[PDB]
RNA sequence: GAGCUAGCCCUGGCCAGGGUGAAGCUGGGGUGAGACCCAGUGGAGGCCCGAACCGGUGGGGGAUGCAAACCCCUCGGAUGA
RNA sequence: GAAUGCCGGCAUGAGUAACGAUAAAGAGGGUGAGAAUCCCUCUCGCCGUAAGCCCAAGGGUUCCUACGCAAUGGUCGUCAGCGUAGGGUUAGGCGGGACCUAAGGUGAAGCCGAAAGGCGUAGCCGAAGGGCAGCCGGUUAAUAUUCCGGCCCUUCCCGCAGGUGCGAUGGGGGGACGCUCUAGGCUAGGGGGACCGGAGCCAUGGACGAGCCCGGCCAGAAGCGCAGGGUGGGAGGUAGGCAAAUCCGCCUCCCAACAAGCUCUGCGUGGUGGGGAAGCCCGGGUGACAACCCCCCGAAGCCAGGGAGCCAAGAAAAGCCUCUAAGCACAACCUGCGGGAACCCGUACCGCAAACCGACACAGGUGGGCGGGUGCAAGAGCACUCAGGCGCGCGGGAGAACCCUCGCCAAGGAACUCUGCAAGUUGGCCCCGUAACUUCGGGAGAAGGGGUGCUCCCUGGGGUGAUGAGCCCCGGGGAGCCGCAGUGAACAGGCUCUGGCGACUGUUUACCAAAAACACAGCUCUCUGCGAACUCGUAAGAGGAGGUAUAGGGAGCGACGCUUGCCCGGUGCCGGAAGGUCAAGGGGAGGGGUGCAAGCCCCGAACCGAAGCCCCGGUGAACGGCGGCCGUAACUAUAACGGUCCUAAGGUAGCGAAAUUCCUUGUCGGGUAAGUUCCGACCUGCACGAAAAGCGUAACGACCGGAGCGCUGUCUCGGCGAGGGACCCGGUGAAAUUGAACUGGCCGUGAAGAUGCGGCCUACCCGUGGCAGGACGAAAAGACCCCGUGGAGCUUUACUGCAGCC
RNA sequence: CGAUGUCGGCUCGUCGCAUCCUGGGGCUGAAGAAGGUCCCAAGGGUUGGGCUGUUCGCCCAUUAAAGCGGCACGCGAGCUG
RNA sequence: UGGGAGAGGGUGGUGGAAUUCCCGGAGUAGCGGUGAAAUGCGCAGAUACCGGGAGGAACGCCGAUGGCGAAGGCAGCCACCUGGUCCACCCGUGACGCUGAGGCGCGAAAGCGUGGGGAGCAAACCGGAUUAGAUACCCGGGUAGUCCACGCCCUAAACG
RNA sequence: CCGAGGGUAGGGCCCGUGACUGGGGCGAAGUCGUAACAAGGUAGCUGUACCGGAAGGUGCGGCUGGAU
């Protein structure tokens, strides 16, 4: 569960923190971290291209194995479960009987001391990774590749999962976390189970300072600006939008679909997201 | 109160310096222009 | 032209002293087991008071100024966005 | 002769303002042509978490000495950061480079762009981060971790001896890390000593004393001791660490294991080298053969890569160690020792400032370290004071008005005023005690009150010792003494009740607004399946994100509580394979020009032919919208009810004379002697109302209202006093402004407000201190207002394009 | 319009008189006392407070009375704002 | 000690029917709905039929006037964990008992909080009818909710 | 020293009263409809929720104290 605080400050009244219960090791593997280069939202031109970014806690990037078909047949003991500042999921340190060490994201139910393996022959058990062809229809699954050998791209956030719905030719049909129904190639790997830390979404940041720790700088409403700045700028006193609600750049931001029209992947998307 | 000129020798040399001017088309035109005018100093003096 | 200013990035540095006393932990009480209650321990916080430091609330002065924004008194923050 | 013309010169204001912090001066002696201002002595004052010392920027000779005083210095000048000249900066160990990487910059490969150029993995560059070997003292007018002295140390080269499978830009380990809190043991620093050293002193009533005053250390290789840091050992297996590996990783077995061991650092000791006060003698000499000891306090510093807790999860690379590959194994490397070698740049001086940034020797700005003592609960606060540094580069008088800053005040006590604006009051610590309300934290320092000095006596626990004395810390009880007064000086909340707005801490209009504005956690809509959407870019490339729907973008709303109604006709958005319209293009009935002709050329109907628009639906926390009239109930009044027009539908809950109410100071109630404000009500709401959210809400606020208590020079109503000015004298000496002036009052007149015209009145000539009614006084070619077929920012269903998208 | 600063307050007055009071009168539906109304008269006087930025006005407590106007709606090189 | 019957409870699994929706085929002029209608859906190809898929909820026959529980209440099937209760033997203990103010626990539905899920149904709501009117009853739509987890709420014609 | 009490300050309980407001009782000669009693013309009652001029309606679950 999430952890609450007595209201001994105005912010502790609402602040909630992760319990960190599954975490068994509080330092990262030295050989598996590299420095994460904070960007502040700036690109190679030095221009802000994603507003309101910067100033968050320093972080080291843990190298994550998003392939796993890298090491078919070679089992590994789950050595630890660790905090990762770069993602919402926890991470699991795997000690391969190879001697090799790698991190994967921690499935829900993973136990330190258990073993996992990857390959067409892997048992359908939590933590193992198989090509989608060989996972039974109906089993929930995470860290799914989108195309073969290109790396796990789907269902990586805390608590998420995709469900195998059926088969058709070289493809399996997944329900993604968004609810979209999509054909994914059967040679795409996936790891059985759902991502752990499902309580992530129940966290209450509690105070403005917490967003700042995360590198989230304050967001400014278009309504608070001037016409030079934003479609919603200006007006005497407060003002309603007085036009269809728009982005800083003028496009409408209430319903306007934005997926590219003739995109080749539409042939593989059966049903747009629900909800 | 704090004013606009806060001398810094590295900052001066790296910004207006001879090597800074030669890197860029606009900077080379500055040098070309100051030589044509006959300036005694083509580039700000900074002691290094 | 970002040696002023605004934002971010990398790497350093700084924040006297005092106050409040969260969680947890231990002991006791309680119970079928519990919740929980009490004491001690503990030392949390965009917590409190207050220097440095960062400010600039009210008033007075200054107004060919000491100063093209200053001075005095008072005042806000001061482990944090 | 005028252009608020241009350049220059010189006036007026004027011997006027001013001479730059109110920390403060006085005298004697000297120097010199000249002295308040330079030197010296004594006295006085100011700083002392600095106004003292050290370092880094920046500055660039300003440093030291001699000789000068025209100018610079707000006066003076014999002086000086000024003029002339001469001298002065010394490094293997300090800092930087011959080392390493960070952001970033550059950039083989590669990619992109009309040109110029933009990117770009590696690599390279890039530091105040990593790494790396010097401490104490002496010396100069001026440099010193640099010279000298003592004791240490580093690298490279060569050699010797011993040892080893040696060998790297390759593999591995390590380097290597947060915040808060913190243990033990030390050190820096400090306090005390009846002990050790010392020149001396006995005053003015007393003291020859366990008297006063002064000092009582610093560095130091090996070794040793104390305290810490780091680190398990052996074998077997091995498929991973882009080759190899004995290394590292993984598995298993064996002893070891909060130990020791090994290793590294700090501290102490340590051969040795130094230093060494007051006082009084002309920076030096003496003190002095100086002594150099004991106790207490004690770091934020050290051991350190220590420990614990927590979530926001806390650089890289090289040095270093290990592994092996080519190689090479008469080499090579490792260890010890010895000799030799060891480069370039900085070093003066100022450095919270008269030498830096501010045009000035400018009350402003400027990063790091040291920053002593006593007392006040603590402290870097406050008062005083050490070391050290200053009295702020005009002075001397005077003792008006007025001004500033300050002190006090009879009686009253907010009567002041827009407002208690301002100023009083309160004020630290210890104890007692503390309300509504509440989100159970708070509200709270609520409020309110008691205590507070000194002396003697008895006593409780702690630290250091030893368990004791001594020192040091925290107490408790009794009895007394003095004053107006005991946080006796300085530093140190006035309080309460009640509304509005915003939940809160935060942010903002640098330099007229700090707020109710922005942000904010939180809520909802919406886009986005990842080569994501979106953003910057012509592109390449980037951000997003080395993220993946519990995620990322956009929008609104803004903790939390209780909620968020009706209208989808119009606009937006979403869905709709029909239909209508629809461009290029396709098609080619039909027709035309020309040729003797084959032919060449042109026009061109039906039909086919996208998005878009039309059309059909959906959609409100999308843009938005949310009525009128007539009638009707046992008195009146009103209208639950009915009728009727219109609309897409007619405002629900809640709230309401409100940050909204025109009429308006609505009406009524409350408070007041009296209340246009305030609070509580009512509801004909000119013109509230539900995420441009509605109604509440504990806590919070330098926000904006209303009231009371305390207390006051705010006021009745003013008075006195202080200092800095104002005034006088000596020194230096501005300014805007200025058509010229020999520049009075009234009543008139005049372009309609006359010193300047008329008539009359008044008036000897010239200043000084004062006051502001006039000179339509100064300043700024009015910001308002209009005008100009003047400009610019902004908007949109103005026009017309363009990017972007389809 | 190459600038003639504005409401209200404070301060400081001075003037007019169509007089609020005080002095002198005539008429009265003037018995007295007190008023009413007109005439003469500008010498002096013409309060403190609550509300509101207010001028004004209303109200409280008084008063002989609580006058009305002008002076760039007197007076910002006098202050406030 | 030995046996029994049971929708007693909790957990994890798991089956088939049906409704709805979506895809493919086939097919066309209506379907639906009512007392009778209309709104509604339908030539943009509905209904009716075949095949395929998704998803939630409830478990037909057995089923009974039946069974179990203290009450609320419990119904496909399997497994595990677990309560109560009856019987036979008449073996053990030796009045160890009954009740029970307070206390504690449980407590249908609706409702509330956080998150999930959402097929059918359906307060509110919109529309069609009915009617003198019809803020109803009937019809076509439709959001909470109904379902799951956790935490509350603690009521009832909680009745025999 | 204690001490009647007086004073300052802050709490507790009770009473009276208050612009205005909430429903309640009664009156009865009114307006609206007809919710319950019959199958009361939608069987009723019910806890709860949402809604409506009003009685009441609907939903979910419960009871029979329901006609046929
Ligand atoms: Mg958990
Ligand atoms: Mg909490
Ligand atoms: Mg807590
Ligand atoms: Mg808690
Ligand atoms: Mg709070
Ligand atoms: Mg609080
Ligand atoms: Mg936690
Ligand atoms: Mg965890
Ligand atoms: Mg760490
Ligand atoms: Mg690394
Ligand atoms: Mg990275
Ligand atoms: Mg990055
Ligand atoms: Mg770059
Ligand atoms: Mg660039
Ligand atoms: Mg952006
Ligand atoms: Mg940004
Ligand atoms: Mg994590
Ligand atoms: Mg989490
Ligand atoms: Mg959240
Ligand atoms: Mg972060
Ligand atoms: Mg955000
Ligand atoms: Mg915002
Ligand atoms: Mg604005
Ligand atoms: Mg702009
Ligand atoms: Mg624009
Ligand atoms: Mg715009
Ligand atoms: Mg707008
Ligand atoms: Mg507007
Ligand atoms: Mg606006
Ligand atoms: Mg408005
Ligand atoms: Mg605005
Ligand atoms: Mg606005
Ligand atoms: Mg606003
Ligand atoms: Mg608007
Ligand atoms: Mg709007
Ligand atoms: Mg609009
Ligand atoms: Mg794809
Ligand atoms: Mg600077
Ligand atoms: Mg400079
Ligand atoms: Mg520099
Ligand atoms: Mg520099
Ligand atoms: Mg620089
Ligand atoms: Mg340069
Ligand atoms: Mg020049
Ligand atoms: Mg030359
Ligand atoms: Mg140049
Ligand atoms: Mg800058
Ligand atoms: Mg850093
Ligand atoms: Mg601090
Ligand atoms: Mg405690
Ligand atoms: Mg603990
Ligand atoms: Mg704080
Ligand atoms: Mg604090
Ligand atoms: Mg504080
Ligand atoms: Mg700042
Ligand atoms: Mg100020
Ligand atoms: Mg003040
Ligand atoms: Mg003053
Ligand atoms: Mg000024
Ligand atoms: Mg000041
Ligand atoms: Mg000051
Ligand atoms: Mg203060
Ligand atoms: Mg503070
Ligand atoms: Mg502090
Ligand atoms: Mg803070
Ligand atoms: Mg002329
Ligand atoms: Mg002129
Ligand atoms: Mg001129
Ligand atoms: Mg001129
Ligand atoms: Mg000129
Ligand atoms: Mg003069
Ligand atoms: Mg002073
Ligand atoms: Mg002199
Ligand atoms: Mg002289
Ligand atoms: Mg001297
Ligand atoms: Mg001191
Ligand atoms: Mg200079
Ligand atoms: Mg020197
Ligand atoms: Mg001179
Ligand atoms: Mg001279
Ligand atoms: Mg000369
Ligand atoms: Mg001079
Ligand atoms: Mg000067
Ligand atoms: Mg001389
Ligand atoms: Mg000088
Ligand atoms: Mg010399
Ligand atoms: Mg040397
Ligand atoms: Mg070399
Ligand atoms: Mg390099
Ligand atoms: Mg380098
Ligand atoms: Mg360096
Ligand atoms: Mg060095
Ligand atoms: Mg040394
Ligand atoms: Mg020297
Ligand atoms: Mg080797
Ligand atoms: Mg690291
Ligand atoms: Mg570091
Ligand atoms: Mg911190
Ligand atoms: Mg300690
Ligand atoms: Mg001491
Ligand atoms: Mg020790
Ligand atoms: Mg191997
Ligand atoms: Mg000596
Ligand atoms: Mg001697
Ligand atoms: Mg001697
Ligand atoms: Mg001796
Ligand atoms: Mg500290
Ligand atoms: Mg540690
Ligand atoms: Mg976290
Ligand atoms: Mg790197
Ligand atoms: Mg070989
Ligand atoms: Mg060796
Ligand atoms: Mg060289
Ligand atoms: Mg050199
Ligand atoms: Mg030097
Ligand atoms: Mg300063
Ligand atoms: Mg400094
Ligand atoms: Mg000076
Ligand atoms: Mg200065
Ligand atoms: Mg010291
Ligand atoms: Mg004190
Ligand atoms: Mg103190
Ligand atoms: Mg202070
Ligand atoms: Mg002292
Ligand atoms: Mg002085
Ligand atoms: Mg005088
Ligand atoms: Mg007085
Ligand atoms: Mg008073
Ligand atoms: Mg009083
Ligand atoms: Mg006030
Ligand atoms: Mg005080
Ligand atoms: Mg109270
Ligand atoms: Mg409480
Ligand atoms: Mg108090
Ligand atoms: Mg209070
Ligand atoms: Mg005394
Ligand atoms: Mg005191
Ligand atoms: Mg005091
Ligand atoms: Mg006193
Ligand atoms: Mg003081
Ligand atoms: Mg205070
Ligand atoms: Mg209050
Ligand atoms: Mg108000
Ligand atoms: Mg409010
Ligand atoms: Mg606020
Ligand atoms: Mg605000
Ligand atoms: Mg709130
Ligand atoms: Mg706030
Ligand atoms: Mg703060
Ligand atoms: Mg401002
Ligand atoms: Mg401004
Ligand atoms: Mg400005
Ligand atoms: Mg400005
Ligand atoms: Mg201001
Ligand atoms: Mg402001
Ligand atoms: Mg503020
Ligand atoms: Mg703002
Ligand atoms: Mg805001
Ligand atoms: Mg909200
Ligand atoms: Mg762009
Ligand atoms: Mg572009
Ligand atoms: Mg790219
Ligand atoms: Mg990227
Ligand atoms: Mg990236
Ligand atoms: Mg992402
Ligand atoms: Mg808020
Ligand atoms: Mg906001
Ligand atoms: Mg807002
Ligand atoms: Mg509440
Ligand atoms: Mg409605
Ligand atoms: Mg609409
Ligand atoms: Mg529409
Ligand atoms: Mg409609
Ligand atoms: Mg429109
Ligand atoms: Mg058709
Ligand atoms: Mg033809
Ligand atoms: Mg022809
Ligand atoms: Mg809604
Ligand atoms: Mg409309
Ligand atoms: Mg709207
Ligand atoms: Mg009637
Ligand atoms: Mg009203
Ligand atoms: Mg209101
Ligand atoms: Mg407002
Ligand atoms: Mg209004
Ligand atoms: Mg109006
Ligand atoms: Mg009004
Ligand atoms: Mg009004
Ligand atoms: Mg009134
Ligand atoms: Mg008021
Ligand atoms: Mg007001
Ligand atoms: Mg009314
Ligand atoms: Mg808005
Ligand atoms: Mg508003
Ligand atoms: Mg709205
Ligand atoms: Mg505030
Ligand atoms: Mg405020
Ligand atoms: Mg006065
Ligand atoms: Mg005095
Ligand atoms: Mg005086
Ligand atoms: Mg004076
Ligand atoms: Mg005086
Ligand atoms: Mg004289
Ligand atoms: Mg003349
Ligand atoms: Mg005239
Ligand atoms: Mg005249
Ligand atoms: Mg005249
Ligand atoms: Mg004349
Ligand atoms: Mg004439
Ligand atoms: Mg004349
Ligand atoms: Mg006259
Ligand atoms: Mg005048
Ligand atoms: Mg004047
Ligand atoms: Mg004149
Ligand atoms: Mg004048
Ligand atoms: Mg004038
Ligand atoms: Mg002009
Ligand atoms: Mg003009
Ligand atoms: Mg103009
Ligand atoms: Mg105007
Ligand atoms: Mg005009
Ligand atoms: Mg025109
Ligand atoms: Mg014209
Ligand atoms: Mg324009
Ligand atoms: Mg777009
Ligand atoms: Mg004008
Ligand atoms: Mg002029
Ligand atoms: Mg002018
Ligand atoms: Mg009579
Ligand atoms: Mg007469
Ligand atoms: Mg008179
Ligand atoms: Mg007169
Ligand atoms: Mg008034
Ligand atoms: Mg009025
Ligand atoms: Mg009135
Ligand atoms: Mg009277
Ligand atoms: Mg007047
Ligand atoms: Mg007028
Ligand atoms: Mg007027
Ligand atoms: Mg006037
Ligand atoms: Mg005036
Ligand atoms: Mg003025
Ligand atoms: Mg005025
Ligand atoms: Mg004037
Ligand atoms: Mg004037
Ligand atoms: Mg005023
Ligand atoms: Mg104003
Ligand atoms: Mg049955
Ligand atoms: Mg028996
Ligand atoms: Mg229940
Ligand atoms: Mg339920
Ligand atoms: Mg429910
Ligand atoms: Mg649904
Ligand atoms: Mg009707
Ligand atoms: Mg609802
Ligand atoms: Mg709901
Ligand atoms: Mg029953
Ligand atoms: Mg008495
Ligand atoms: Mg009924
Ligand atoms: Mg009936
Ligand atoms: Mg019935
Ligand atoms: Mg209702
Ligand atoms: Mg009605
Ligand atoms: Mg209904
Ligand atoms: Mg029942």
Numbering used by the authors:
A (entry chain 1D): 2 to 276
B (entry chain 17): 1 to 48
The authors write:
Here, we discover that well-known ribosomal antibiotics, hygromycin A (HygA) and macrolides, which target peptidyl transferase center and peptide exit tunnel, respectively, can act cooperatively against susceptible and drug-resistant bacteria.
To this end, we co-crystallized wild-type (WT) 70S ribosomes from the Gram-negative bacterium Thermus thermophilus (Tth) with HygA and one of the three macrolides (ERY, azithromycin (AZI), or TEL) and determined their structures at 2.5–2.6 Å resolution. Consistent with the previous structure, HygA binds in the A-site cleft of the PTC on the large ribosomal subunit with its aromatic ring sandwiched between nucleotides A2451 and C2452 of the 23S rRNA, and is oriented such that the aminocyclitol group protrudes toward nucleotide C2573, while the fucofuranose ring extends into the ribosome exit tunnel. In all three structures of macrolides in combination with HygA, the desosamine moiety of a macrolide forms two hydrogen bonds (H-bonds), which were suggested to be crucial for macrolide binding: one between the hydroxyl group of the desosamine and the N1 atom of the nucleotide A2058, and the second one between the dimethylamino group of desosamine sugar and the N6 atom of A2058 via a water molecule that is also coordinated by the phosphate of G2505. Compared to its position in the drug-free ribosome, nucleotide A2062 rotates by ~160 degrees and forms a Hoogsteen base-pair with the nucleotide m2A2503 in the presence of HygA, or a macrolide, or both. Ribosome-bound HygA favors this rotated conformation of A2062 via direct H-bond with the N6 atom of this nucleotide.
